[PDB]
Write an enzyme that holds these catalytic residues in place. Structure first.
Site, PDB file in Angstrom:
ATOM      1  CD  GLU A  11      -2.968  -1.212   0.540  1.00 15.52           C
ATOM      2  OE1 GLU A  11      -3.098  -0.141  -0.151  1.00 15.52           O
ATOM      3  OE2 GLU A  11      -3.737  -2.125   0.459  1.00 15.52           O
ATOM      4  CG  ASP A  20      -8.234   3.800  -3.934  1.00 10.90           C
ATOM      5  OD1 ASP A  20      -8.649   4.280  -5.046  1.00 10.90           O
ATOM      6  OD2 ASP A  20      -8.926   3.111  -3.199  1.00 10.90           O
TER       7      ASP A  20
END
Ligand SMILES: [Cl-]
Ligand SMILES: [Cl-]
EC number: 3.2.1.17
Length: 162
Positions: A11, A20
């Protein structure tokens, strides 16, 4: 290697609101803020999450705090889920990390939707579960991460991360 290190690789870490892969407002170590298009809805969610006026930016400590909460929540969700719990209980330590990874990224619900793959992991049919896991939007949308998690399931080692 542990869950934290794994997810930190998958991440990354960002101290300012970001979008994202899906275009959703996120901060820190994959901490989803909102699916809403509004940057303001995000900033507000951020303040609520932190309990201070952040103005879209946080410190590393704050990022890590959110990270601790998210992993804890991911684990507690699996343990409370009738479809996930049994798969989890059946796996060895490394492969358990891999299921936590998926739940962190895609939510309990999402994961619980991988019925057939779950059944195959439960039966310990590694190669077949691996093939089935890849036939997913998840694999097509984030292939390198999916490959890493999928290899973890297939081998039971941390090679993909090393
Ligand atoms: Cl497909
Ligand atoms: Cl990817």
């Amino acid at each position: 290697m542990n869950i934290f290190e794994m997810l930190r690789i998958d991440e990354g870490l960002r101290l300012k609101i970001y979008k994202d892969t899906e275009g959703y407002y996120t901060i820190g170590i994959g901490h989803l803020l909102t699916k809403s298009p509004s940057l303001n809805a995000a900033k507000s969610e951020l303040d609520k999450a932190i309990g201070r006026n952040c103005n879209g930016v946080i410190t590393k400590d704050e990022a890590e705090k959110l990270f601790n909460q998210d992993v804890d929540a991911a684990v507690r969700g699996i343990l409370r889920n009738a479809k996930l719990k049994p798969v989890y209980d059946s796996l060895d330590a490394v492969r358990r990390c891999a299921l936590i990874n998926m739940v962190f990224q895609m939510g309990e619900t999402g994961v619980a939707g991988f019925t057939n793959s779950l059944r195959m992991l439960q039966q310990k049919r590694w190669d077949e579960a691996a093939v089935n896991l890849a036939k997913s939007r998840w694999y097509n949308q984030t292939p390198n991460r999916a490959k890493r998690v999928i290899t973890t399931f297939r081998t039971g080692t941390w090679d993909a991360y090393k």
